[PDB]
Amino acid sequence: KQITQSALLAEARSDYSEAAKQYDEALNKQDWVDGEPTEAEKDFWELASLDCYNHLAEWKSLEYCSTASIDSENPPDLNKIWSEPFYQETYLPYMIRSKLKLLLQGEADQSLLTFIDKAMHGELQKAILELHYSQELSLLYLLQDDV
Amino acid sequence: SARKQNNFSLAMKLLKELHKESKTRDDWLVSWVQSYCRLSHCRSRSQGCSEQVLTVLKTVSLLDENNVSSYLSKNILAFRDQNILLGTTYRIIANALSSEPACLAEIEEDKARRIVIAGLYQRAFQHLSEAVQA
Secondary structure, three states: OOHOOOOOOOOOOOHHHHHHHHHHHHHOOOOOOOOOOOOOHHHHHHHHHHHHHOOOOOOOOHHHHHHHHOOOOOOOOOHHOOOOOOHHHHHHHHHHHHHHHHHOOOOOOOOHHHHHHHHOOOHHHOOHHHHHHHHHHOOOOOHHOOH | OOOHHHHOOOOHHHHHHHHHHHOOOOOOOOOHHHHHHHHHHHHOOOOOOOOHHHHHHHOOOOOOOOOOOOOOOOHHHHHHHHHHHHHOOOOOOOOOOOOOOOOOOHHHHHHHOOOOOOHOOOOOOHHHHHHHHH
16 A cells, blocks of 8 residues: 555655655664465565666665665675575666766765675676676676776 | 656755856756756655745745846746745635744735735735736
8 A cells, every 4th residue: 555556756855755665764674464374475575676666867865775685794604605696686786776876976886896896706606607697797897998 | 857757856966066066147946947957857746835845936936036137048047936935825815824924924015015014915806817917
């Protein structure tokens, strides 16, 4: 009733974002008792939603949305538990589409550099499947004039 | 292009960038057509008749008397003004929407004037449809 009634509103920075953000900001300590069985369902879905509204927009909304779904504080447990899930493996382009906006800002920037590097760290083991899966991985190089 | 599709909020950040960026006399009006369309788009939703129609009707004639001292091209820019006006004269019957005065009802007095409740409560229907009429 917050979000299926957002598909209508056809906006992707206010209505959906207010329908989504308070779920993680408030900690939902009293509504997590009844919604405790959902687990990943309530989670990843909200996770997923916070993507598919801004997945097109990128911009500060995106770096912050990664920040929500990324592995920023402690980035090795996620990869050390799963290699590729049919959910978190979907946020890889999300953060990096934000590259487009911050890579526009500066020629060598935190998001892009850290990313493409760690993407090469994970390239060493099962590169080609992921490098093939993502075309966006291509569109990024052209910045530093190296075709 | 973003306007008609009704994407809104991506178009919010865009309307901020264009409002900011283009910085000429035809700019201001160009951005305003966009905010006014967005006005119709959220008038589709409820209570914006009080809110957003005010947010965009505010400057639709302040900096407008001094803008493109014609010159050509005005129809496509003055009409959306007419939209922010019918979208109230036809919606605003009385009361409720006047809830937040100090500045609000004052606006109806002034707009009706060039184009403090009784000059509106007893008269604003011969005022609004005429301001929109011009």
